[PDB]
Amino acid sequence: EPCVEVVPNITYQCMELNFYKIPDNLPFSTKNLDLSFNPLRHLGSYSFFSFPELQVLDLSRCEIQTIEDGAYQSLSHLSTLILTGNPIQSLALGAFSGLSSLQKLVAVETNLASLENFPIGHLKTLKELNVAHNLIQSFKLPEYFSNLTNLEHLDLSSNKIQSIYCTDLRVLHQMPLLNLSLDLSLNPMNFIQPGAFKEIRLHKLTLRNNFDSLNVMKTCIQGLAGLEVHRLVLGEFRNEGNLEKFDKSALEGLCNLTIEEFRLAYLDYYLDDIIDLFNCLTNVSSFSLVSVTIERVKDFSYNFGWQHLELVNCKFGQFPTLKLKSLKRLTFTSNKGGNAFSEVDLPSLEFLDLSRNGLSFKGCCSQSDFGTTSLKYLDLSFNGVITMSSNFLGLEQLEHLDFQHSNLKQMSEFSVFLSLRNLIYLDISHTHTRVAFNGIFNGLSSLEVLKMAGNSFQENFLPDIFTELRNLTFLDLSQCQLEQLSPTAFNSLSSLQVLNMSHNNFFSLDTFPYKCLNSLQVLDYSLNHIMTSKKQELQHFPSSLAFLNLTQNDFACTCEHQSFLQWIKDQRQLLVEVERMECATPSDKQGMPVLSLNITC
């Protein structure tokens, strides 16, 4: 059994161990077996029998040259078979007989030259068939595709198809219901016979890096005419042959197609115009551009009927002045470009993610910044500086707001959140805030979560700023260099359940403030510098308090604090990882669990 037992009686990975023959010294209950990178080279009849209850079989790169009739005859439960990278020469007419439950068949780079003779026509349960990186030249789907009634995914990418003739799709004309997601990327396409796709319906179609010239692309997209796709994905690969031009006509053909969601995934050419270029996708409901340079675009004002717009990893320079009236959700993230946000005007906007762009806002937050009054979600995390100068006038409905990791300024200069009466989630962790106004959170009634880790307070004393946050159920307050603490702080947080106070600078754990935390269940206090206890009223810990981390500190293990070091032992039914509560003061006795000391005085 040089194999590795990942999940006893269940999952074994005998990968690359020079097996010339299938192991047998393994349990019968086995459901997942990986026999990758082993020189099997001959898959004969009933090769697998030692595993009648198998569900997943990985035969990746096993030099398998010939599979005979009924090699997996006894695998009725097998749903996934992976044969990636095998130099197949002979494939028996009934090699896949017995897999009455096969849903996923992976035959990538298996020397497969034609879909015509692939013996799978009886696997009715087949959901996805991956045959990418093979020698297929024709797109003519076999007749047996009829019996394949549960097929949803077909990967024909990286093959040798060069043209699509009408007759190739004849099989589909006879399968009404047929949620097929097709990938034809990296096939040297150069001709799709006109009218070949008339009344054909795909759920998804991906054609990336298929066409040689712009003219070859426009020609093929014409043969695509009449198609109905739910989601269509075009574009190319960064590490392969790209188009030398992509002018305002490249996408003309899409006008004679019925598309619901569109996505252009990576284009080397620097876009010039955006309105003449995409007006055939105007009726589209979801529009996406990932990794495309749009610096050269002067007008971002056209009113497309798009409802979801997603721009990720694009180079832009000046911030796009969007004025899409029907748009409801906008995802503008991880874009390498400028560093200055400017107003947008999205009257219908409800979801707004503008995170990870290094953007800087010179005046937050108002409805005049976005042009909407229906915003419910707002994510401006991971950006540059965000100066607060308006307490969300017009954004009353915000339920979610994330400023995480963005330098925020003017926080304690007035009540910036005064209008957010419905805000439920709020993360301002590591936003370099310096709380210095006890009205910092006024307005946040409905608030339930509040992550303000990584910051700091004036004088390092935690004031009474939570007195209005009733439904408050979570509250991170770690890394805030807190030292002192107002005893009346948490006193109104009845529903509060968790309360992080980790990695701070406390030296004396207390227990009075937590007296009224009815629902309090968790209370992290780790990575601090506690050891003392300036008040032995150590009984005031809520009746529901289950967990109470106190791991890693600088305890005082000298009789000097026998009174407090004992209380720790007294209730080790609330603590956590005790093998990490090592002592710190005895230069001779350090590293021994505090819940194990000779209390000899």
Partner 1 sequence: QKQYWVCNSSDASISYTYCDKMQYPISINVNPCIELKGSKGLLHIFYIPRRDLKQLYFNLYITVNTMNLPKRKEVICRGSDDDYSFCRALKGETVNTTISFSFKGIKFSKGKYKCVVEAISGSPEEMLFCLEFVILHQPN
Ligand X SMILES: *[C@@H]1O[C@H](CO)[C@@H](O[C@@H]2O[C@H](CO)[C@@H](O)[C@H](O)[C@H]2NC(C)=O)[C@H](O)[C@H]1NC(C)=O
Ligand Y SMILES: *O[C@H]1[C@H](O[C@H]2O[C@H]([C@@H](O)CO[C@H]3O[C@H]([C@@H](O)CO)[C@@H](O)[C@H](O)[C@@H]3O)[C@@H](O*)[C@H](O)[C@@H]2O)[C@H](O)[C@@H](O[C@H]2[C@@H]([C@H](O)CO)O[C@@](OC[C@H]3O[C@@H](OC[C@H]4O[C@H](O)[C@H](N)[C@@H](O)[C@@H]4O)[C@H](N)[C@@H](O)[C@@H]3O)(C(=O)O)C[C@H]2O[C@]2(C(=O)O)C[C@@H](O)[C@@H](O)[C@@H]([C@H](O)CO)O2)O[C@@H]1[C@@H](O)CO
Query: Which of partner 1, ligand NAG, a copy of itself, none does residue 240 bind (CB under 5 to 8 Å by kind)?
Result: partner 1
Q: Tell me the backbone φ, ψ of residue 218, rounded to 5 degrees.
A: -60, -35
- Cα separations in angstroms, 572 against 212, 375, 483, 542, 559: 70, 47, 25, 15, 20
Q: Give min distance, CB of 440 to ligand FTT, in A.
A: 10
* Range 20-59, binding partner 1 (CB under 8 A): 36-37, 58
Binds 406, which of ligand NAG, ligand Y, ligand X, none (CB < 5 to 8 A, cut-off by type)? none
| Bridge-based pairing state of the strands 11-13 and 4-7 | antiparallel
Partner from partner 1, ligand X, ligand Y, none binding residue 524, C-beta < 5-8 Å depending on class: ligand X
Torsion, Cα 293 295 299 303, to 10 degrees, reads: 30
Whole-number Å distance between alpha carbons of 96 and 503: 58
Site string for ligand X, 10-39 (x = CB under 6 A): ------------------------------
- Beta carbons of 148 and 122 less than 8 angstroms apart: no
Cβ at position 349, least distance to ligand NAG in Å: 24
DSSP 343-407: ----TT--EEE--SS--BEEEEEEHHHHT-S---EEE--S-SEEEEEEEEET-TT--EEE-TTSE
Beta strand 228-235 pairing with 56-58:
unpaired
For 220, the token pair is 């093929």
Question: Which residue is at the shortest CB distance from ligand X?
Answer: 549
Phi then psi dihedrals of residue 85, to 5 deg: 70, 35
Q: Please report, as residue ranges, which positions from 418 to 437 form the binding site for partner 1 (by CB under 8 A).
A: 418-419, 436-437
**Residue 70 in the binding site for a copy of itself (CB under 8 A):** no
Which of ligand FTT, a copy of itself, ligand NAG, none is residue 260 near (CB under 5 to 8 Å by kind)? Answer: none
- The answer to whether residues 179 and 149 touch, using CB atoms and an 8 Å cutoff, is no
- In the complex with partner 1, the residue whose CB is nearer, 390 or 551, is 390
Per CB under 8 A, which region of 30-38, 59-67, 382-390, 492-500 contacts a copy of itself? 382-390
Q: Which of 82, 349, 395, 398 is close enough to bind partner 1 by CB under 8 A?
A: 82
Query: Which of 38, 397, 502, 553: binder of ligand X (CB under 6 A)?
Result: 502
Q: How many residues bind ligand X (CB under 6 A)?
A: 16
Candidates 191, 269, 302, 414; binder of ligand FTT (CB under 6 A) is 414
User: What's the number of CA atoms in the CB half-sphere (13 Å) around residue 552?
Assistant: 8
Q: Which does 526 bind (CB under 5 to 8 A by kind): ligand FTT, ligand NAG, partner 1, none?
A: none
Which of 17, 26, 290, 385 lies at the binding interface for a copy of itself (CB under 8 A)?
385
- Site residues (CB under 6 A) for ligand FTT, limited to 125-144: none
Q: Per-residue x/- marks for partner 1, 377-396, CB under 8 A?
A: ------------xxx-x---
**What is the spatial distance between Cα 209 and Cα 221, in angstroms, rounded to a whole number?**
13
Query: Looking at residue 459, what DSSP letter applies?
Result: G
173-192: which residues touch ligand NAG (CB under 6 A)? Answer: 179, 181
| 237 part of the interface to partner 1, by CB under 8 A | yes
Residue-wise burial string across 124-161, b where 16 or more C-beta atoms lie within 10 A, e elsewhere = ebbbbbbbbbbebebbbbbebbeebeebebbbbbbbeb
- Sole binder of a copy of itself in the list 432, 515, 540, 561 (CB under 8 A): 432
Specify the stretch interacting with a copy of itself by CB under 8 A; choose among 29-37, 121-129, 268-276, 379-387.
Answer: 379-387
In the bound state with partner 1, the residue whose beta carbon lies nearer, of 193 and 492, is 492
Provide the 3-class DSSP secondary structure of residue 217: helix
- 444-483: which residues touch ligand NAG (CB under 6 A)? 445-446, 471
Beta strand 11-13 with 128-130 is unpaired
Based on the shown chain and the rule CB under 6 A, indicate whether residue 76 belongs to the binding site for ligand NAG. Answer: no
Taking the C-alpha atoms of residue 525 and residue 550, their distance in angstroms, rounded to an integer, is 5
Based on its alpha-carbon atoms, the radius of gyration of the chain, rounded to whole angstroms, reads: 32
Which of 200, 138, 152, 192 minimizes the C-alpha distance to 174?
Answer: 200
Q: Which of residues 347-386 bind ligand Y (CB under 6 A)?
A: 363
Shortest distance in whole angstroms from residue 482 CB to ligand X: 12
Residue 563 within binding range of a copy of itself, rule CB under 8 A: no
Alpha-carbon distances of 544 from 492, 499, 568, rounded to whole Å: 16, 13, 18
Residue numbers of the site for a copy of itself (CB under 8 A)? Answer: 338-340, 358, 360, 362, 384-385, 387, 407, 432, 481, 505
Residue numbers of the site for partner 1 (CB under 8 A)? Answer: 15-16, 36-37, 58, 60-61, 82, 84-86, 106, 108-109, 132-133, 157, 186, 206, 208-209, 233, 235, 237-240, 263, 265-266, 290-291, 313, 366, 389-391, 393, 412-415, 418-419, 436-439, 442
Residue numbers of the site for ligand Y (CB under 6 A)? Answer: 268, 293, 315, 363, 389
